[PDB]
Design a protein around this ligand. Structure first.
Ligand SMILES: CN(CC[C@H](N)CC(=O)N[C@H]1C=C[C@H](N2C=C[C@@](N)(O)NC2=O)O[C@@H]1C(=O)O)C(=N)N
Ligand SMILES: CN(CC[C@H](N)CC(=O)N[C@H]1C=C[C@H](N2C=C[C@@](N)(O)NC2=O)O[C@@H]1C(=O)O)C(=N)N
Ligand SMILES: CN(CC[C@H](N)CC(=O)N[C@H]1C=C[C@H](N2C=C[C@@](N)(O)NC2=O)O[C@@H]1C(=O)O)C(=N)N
Ligand SMILES: CN(CC[C@H](N)CC(=O)N[C@H]1C=C[C@H](N2C=C[C@@](N)(O)NC2=O)O[C@@H]1C(=O)O)C(=N)N
Ligand SMILES: [As]
Ligand SMILES: [As]
Ligand SMILES: [As]
Ligand SMILES: [As]
Ligand SMILES: [Zn+2]
Ligand SMILES: [Zn+2]
Ligand SMILES: [Zn+2]
Ligand SMILES: [Zn+2]
Lengths: 126, 126, 126, 126
């Protein structure tokens, strides 16, 4: 319902729907920075651990000296909507942006922002 | 080459435009067949945070860049050109088989080398 | 308190304490199979995503046609005790062994077996 | 060579001793300086599940094998020898710089090749 939430979802959705359907690049992500910017990116699939969209976003933000990221979401291609961050993404997000929130779907399938720590209970502290 | 220098210059500007960091310490820049340039910075993590080159691949994909023809990585602390790691070579060989990577030759001078030459008898993923 | 729990912890602990102190190999893991076997392994640290001990254990079990794994634990070197599985390990465990439990420490720092799904709420379904 | 054939034979027996699987489809066997042989099977996962070779590295480390001198990977479906992937070459070059890998030559016959030759102008991690 949030304007910030709807906008992030919109940017990620528009990003994935603007590229050709691909099995290598099938998810887009968008994150909001505390200094007033939004960074996007798409995943790179590879058996050796190609980065999820969220990790591409982290590198894109870093390249712009974005600093602290407060919220991030991932949207799947072919109108799949919000995709929950995988376990590796949660670990990287927790270690590099502990104050970040991730948008996921609740029981009713409605968008909801959750603290990263809640997505990774008793998380490993690197 | 003009295109070569262009990527080196862009990646160098990128890493020199962000705070010194152990998490974000390398920048990369790639050239697409259409002539566009894409950049990115690595995201270090023990679970396999993406190298700058992989962030670049995802950034280009988010822009529907298509095929990439050349890519280089520049390290912080004035280290200069860094040869692509083994994982990067595999991902590049699988997603952009015709791409070339810039590395330092015997005399420490930059040069463009085909991906296949950097991964002889390479494993071809199906 | 469980005998099965104490034994897994013991096997993992004995495994890590039997090798030279290393920054590359610093954690051991042990998992129980439904067919009556216990598999161990140590991590392999690498920036490209060297496998955590638990992933080495998964490959070791697979090599023995172990089948279904029911419980797994990780023990750090230098008497660090039980280490919670990282986010990537949780994702791999969920996708390859959905019925498995992981031993982690509770508020009182006491060993406790938890369902993998509880360690990865609203988990991404590959 | 006798040692060569030994690794090939061991890895072949390993992959042929487990159920056909898309998650566990390659076996690897390595030789240590002391003469011991270590095996393992890959663990496929998009977040970067370990290749069989990395599982082998962790298995050897759990036995305090020390330095590894040679390693090979054998694929299921009677595919035979598989060249080590780019990520594997990087990890091998960083943790076992003097190791050699068995690959198929021009005539498709097995041969031992130094890791450095498989990763020319390789990135050296610090
Ligand atoms: C044959 N092949 C493989 C196809 C394979 N089915 C692709 C696949 O499953 N990709 C997925 C891998 C990562 C990605 N993903 C998942 C969770 C996330 N929210 O953290 N962020 C993210 O980017 O989601 C993709 C997704 O749902 O299409 C090739 N690409 N060649
Ligand atoms: C303590 N710590 C770790 C510090 C560690 N020394 C960082 C490090 O070595 N990072 C490296 C990881 C990836 C990156 N790299 C390497 C090869 C490449 N050309 O493919 N592309 C690429 O981006 O190069 C970085 C580099 O040389 O500083 C933390 N960040 N917390
Ligand atoms: C300089 N350097 C890096 C040193 C670095 N500090 C090592 C490090 O942090 N390793 C960690 C990486 C993975 C491992 N780990 C974590 C969570 C797990 N339960 O899922 N399973 C697992 O094996 O835990 C190790 C641990 O706690 O020592 C080198 N190795 N060269
Ligand atoms: C649908 N799916 C994916 C199926 C996929 N085709 C599996 C696949 O290609 N796996 C490969 C991933 C790693 C492995 N591999 C590659 C190079 C190596 N020499 O370094 N060592 C190694 O173990 O080789 C396997 C291989 O050739 O079957 C699932 N498992 N769910
Ligand atoms: As939000
Ligand atoms: As070039
Ligand atoms: As248990
Ligand atoms: As050999
Ligand atoms: Zn992810
Ligand atoms: Zn790399
Ligand atoms: Zn892990
Ligand atoms: Zn590999």
């Amino acid at each position: 319902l949030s304007q910030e939430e709807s906008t992030l979802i919109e940017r990620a959705t528009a990003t994935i729907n603007s590229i050709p359907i691909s099995e290598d690049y099938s998810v887009a992500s968008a994150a909001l920075s505390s200094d007033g910017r939004i960074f996007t990116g798409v995943n790179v699939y590879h058996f050796t651990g190609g980065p999820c969209a969220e990790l591409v976003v982290l590198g894109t933000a870093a390249a712009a000296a974005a600093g602290n990221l407060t919220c991030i979401v991932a949207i799947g291609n072919e109108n799949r909507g919000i995709l929950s961050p995988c376990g590796r993404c949660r670990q990287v997000l927790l270690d590099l942006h502990p104050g970040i929130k991730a948008i996921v779907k609740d029981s009713d399938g409605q968008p909801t922002a959750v603290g990263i720590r809640e997505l990774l209970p008793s998380g490993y502290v690197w």
